Design a protein around this ligand. Structure first.
Ligand SMILES: Nc1nc2c(ncn2[C@@H]2O[C@H](COP(=O)(O)OP(=O)(O)O)[C@@H](O)[C@H]2O)c(=O)[nH]1
Ligand SMILES: [Mg+2]
Length: 382
């Protein structure tokens, strides 16, 4: 019988985690632009005379899944912690976000630091784009240095697109696994404007900034900004009370992350605890006409502040989906916003409940985003 090992992959959204797992397990490079929520794969590998069956646990890199991701950590044998060579920001998040999370939930589990998209290091288009932000591709020595800094078992670079170095990543992860076991915010109402349309200033400002500087950017809302930058912006907002000067933030993705963070951390979700189940049930109705009618009914039950803020957000997200540059259609946006605006029916649900809710959240957002622009616009009085 083969030796079984559990491998969990983590890292910033869109840094290449799924493509790496699929190229290795299926020998085929996925061409679609779709964010992962949670998926499981199986791959075989022969290492040091042993046949090993690797269970590959794919996860979402978005901050929106910070509360749900830990459900994947129990019994992990090795972690693949990734960043992309064409994204210095994704490397910055390795010691700032990923290492603290993994060491908390997976103490003593070996970590392989992986630099993805190696094929882009000398890509001129990539270099020109990074230069606009005064950046450049990550250098090999930087990856190795970071690996030593975080106590990783090793560092490996690869390109799922060219297949270069892919098996080596899993060979090292498998050896690490074998060696390690050898011999062993208040309520929304407190932030909104005085009357209809009742929306928080931070939401209006973020949306306006994003529509001004982000509709031509690939992966809006899928790509998170530097964890530190978002934390600083959030800290200032809640302390100074006024919205920070967003025009001074060079990375528009950080503004997207700020908006999602604000919404996700409200005392209760945008759709409220009281209607959480009603929304999920309405979206789960098989018959489209009946589902749509049930969703209109649920929206009509929301408090004014929640309805107006939701309407403003839906109009904005429809524009994001309609842009030919973002590659973020309704289905993609629903996957990212599910935990952020739907969330759960209680403050601290148990793991069983958290898991049960996962599949139900995106459906709610997809249904809401599919409601007519004319419908949402009435609440904006335009
Ligand atoms: N150039 C290049 N692009 C890649 C590579 N791997 C993934 N990508 C692209 O990066 C984007 C996100 O990939 P994906 O694996 O879905 O990201 P994930 O959110 O970490 O699972 C997609 O456009 C992929 O085609 C790579 O090795 N080289
Ligand atoms: Mg993925």
């Amino acid at each position: 019988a083969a030796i079984r090992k559990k491998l969990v992959i983590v890292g910033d959204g869109a840094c290449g985690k799924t493509c790496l797992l699929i190229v290795f397990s299926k020998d085929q490079f996925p061409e679609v632009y779709v964010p992962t929520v949670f998926e499981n794969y199986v791959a075989d590998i022969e290492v040091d005379g042993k046949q090993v069956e690797l269970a590959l646990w794919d996860t979402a890199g978005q901050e929106d899944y910070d509360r749900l991701r830990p459900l994947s950590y129990p019994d992990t044998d090795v972690i693949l912690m990734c960043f992309s060579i064409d994204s210095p920001d994704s490397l910055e998040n390795i010691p700032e976000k990923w290492t603290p999370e993994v060491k908390h939930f997976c103490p003593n589990v070996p970590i392989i630091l992986v630099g993805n998209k190696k094929d882009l290091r000398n890509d001129e288009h990539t270099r020109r784009e990074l230069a606009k932000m005064k950046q450049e591709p990550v250098k090999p020595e930087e990856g190795r240095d970071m690996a030593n800094r975080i106590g990783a078992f090793g560092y490996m670079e690869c390109s799922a697109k060219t297949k270069d170095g892919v098996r080596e990543v899993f060979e090292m992860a498998t050896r690490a696994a074998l060696q390690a076991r050898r011999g062993k915010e208040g309520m929304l109402a407190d932030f909104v404007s005085q009357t209809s349309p009742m929306i928080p200033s931070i939401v209006v400002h973020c949306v306006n900034e994003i529509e001004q500087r982000g509709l031509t950017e690939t992966g809006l809302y899928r790509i998170d900004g530097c964890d530190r930058t978002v934390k600083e912006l959030k800290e200032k907002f809640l302390r100074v009370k006024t919205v920070p000067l967003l025009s001074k933030v060079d990375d528009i993705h950080a503004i997207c992350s700020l908006l999602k963070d604000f919404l996700r951390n409200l005392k209760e979700p945008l759709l409220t605890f009281r209607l959480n189940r009603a929304f999920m049930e309405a979206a789960e109705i098989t018959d489209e006409d009946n589902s749509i009618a049930a969703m209109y009914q649920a929206v009509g039950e929301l408090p004014q502040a929640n309805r107006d803020t939701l309407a403003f957000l839906m109009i904005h997200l429809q524009r994001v989906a309609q842009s030919p540059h973002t590659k973020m259609d309704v289905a993609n946006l629903a996957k990212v916003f599910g935990p952020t605006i739907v969330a759960h029916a209680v403050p601290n649900p148990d793991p069983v409940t958290m898991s049960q809710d996962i599949k139900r959240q995106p459906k709610v957002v997809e249904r809401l985003l599919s409601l007519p622009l004319e419908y949402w616009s009435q609440f904006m009085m335009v």
